Paper text:
Arabidopsis [name] Grx, [name], was the first plant monothiol Grx to be characterized and plays an important role in redox regulation and protection against oxidative stress in chloroplasts. [name] is classified as a monothiol glutaredoxin with a CGFS active-site motif. Monothiol Grxs contain a single cysteine residue in the putative active-site motif CXXS and are conserved across species. It has been shown that monothiol Grxs have diverse biological functions such as protection against protein oxidation in chloroplasts, biogenesis of iron–sulfur clusters in mitochondria and regulation of iron homeostasis.
The crystal structure of [name] has been determined at 2.4 Å resolution. The structural model contains residues 65–173 of [name], the [name] signal peptide of which is removed. There is only one protein molecule in the crystallographic asymmetric unit. The structure of [name] has a glutaredoxin/thioredoxin-like fold with a core four-stranded parallel β-sheet flanked by five α-helices on both sides. A long groove is observed adjacent to Cys97 with a width of 11–14 Å and a length of 16–19 Å. The groove is formed by highly conserved residues present in plant monothiol Grxs and would be the binding site for glutathione (GSH), i.e. a γ-­Glu-Cys-Gly tripeptide. Structural comparative analysis shows that a glutathione molecule may fit into this groove, form a disulfide bond with the catalytic Cys97 and interact with several charged residues including Lys89, Arg126 and Asp152. In addition, comparative structural studies and sequence-alignment analysis of monothiol and dithiol Grxs reveal that monothiol Grxs (e.g. CGFS-type Grxs), with the exceptions of ScGrx6, ScGrx7 and GrxS12, have five additional amino acids (i.e. Thr91-Arg92-Asp93-Phe94-Pro95 in [name]) immediately upstream of the active-site Cys97. Most interestingly, similar to dithiol Grxs, ScGrx6, ScGrx7 and GrxS12 lack these five amino-acid residues and are also active in hydroxyethyl disulfide HEDS assays and have GSH-dependent oxido­reductase activity. This long unique loop with five additional residues adjacent to the catalytic Cys97 may be a key structural feature of monothiol Grxs.
Author numbering: 65 to 173
The structure:
């Protein structure tokens, strides 16, 4: 395994600390990857507030999230403390309107 009871507890706490939490390569102002950039732009377009976490400077967290989310890469988007999806799924839910529905639901709880 790549995670422990404490790591899992912290991750659960981390993804629930804000309504929308984005795990990316780089920072919102300085995306290190095109895939990470697309999600940030999506989120900026919708005017939804969010927390961005750079996983390029913390391997334990990176490897733990891959297992926690059961998704091998980043970006990884969380909404309402539940894993929403990686790049492809976030882009599609954006075109579809499902992304917005999810965020609203989260913002209004």
């Amino acid at each position: 395994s790549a995670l422990t009871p404490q790591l899992k507890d912290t991750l659960e706490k981390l993804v629930n600390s804000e309504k929308v939490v984005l795990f990316m390569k780089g920072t919102r102002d300085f995306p290190m990857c095109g895939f990470s950039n697309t999600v940030v732009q999506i989120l900026k377009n919708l005017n939804v507030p969010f927390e961005d976490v750079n996983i390029l400077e913390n391997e334990m967290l990176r490897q733990g999230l891959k297992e926690y989310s059961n998704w091998p890469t980043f970006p990884q988007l969380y909404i309402g403390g539940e894993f929403f999806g990686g790049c492809d799924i976030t882009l599609e839910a954006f075109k579809t309107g499902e992304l917005q529905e999810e965020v609203e639901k989260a913002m209004c709880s």
